[PDB]
Design a binder for this molecule. Structure first.
Ligand SMILES: *[C@@H]1O[C@H](CO)[C@@H](O)[C@H](O)[C@H]1NC(C)=O
Lengths: 48, 48
């Protein structure tokens, strides 16, 4: 999320045993970085 | 430690008795708060 041009990243890695979808359960995402880029971002894309 | 002192951490000024804590701060976490929005535990800017 980009709040006032600061790129905050919250990340979390958990194991699962499934191939279908997002599992039922609860887990929180610890903050990772702040990138003070100041960029208006409106579209994105992932890279495989 | 164990003495009532005027402590100043990164501008987080106050007065209290700094003791050894058994809280488990996450690596990013810097300081704690009390229900009254007052600091209860801090991370020393020099010694983590
Ligand atoms: C400087 O701060 C770092 C932060 O962890 C600490 O490891 C180091 O011992 C400090 N050195 C001096 C000379 O204050």
């Amino acid at each position: 999320k980009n709040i006032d041009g600061y790129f905050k990243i919250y990340s979390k890695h958990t194991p699962i045993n499934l191939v279908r979808d997002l599992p039922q359960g609860f887990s929180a995402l610890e903050p990772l970085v702040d990138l003070p880029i100041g960029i208006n971002i409106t579209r994105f894309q992932t890279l495989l | 430690k164990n003495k009532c002192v005027n402590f100043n951490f990164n501008g987080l000024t106050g007065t209290g008795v700094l003791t050894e804590s058994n809280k488990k701060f996450l690596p990013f976490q810097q300081f704690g708060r009390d229900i009254a929005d007052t600091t209860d535990a801090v991370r020393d800017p020099q010694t983590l």
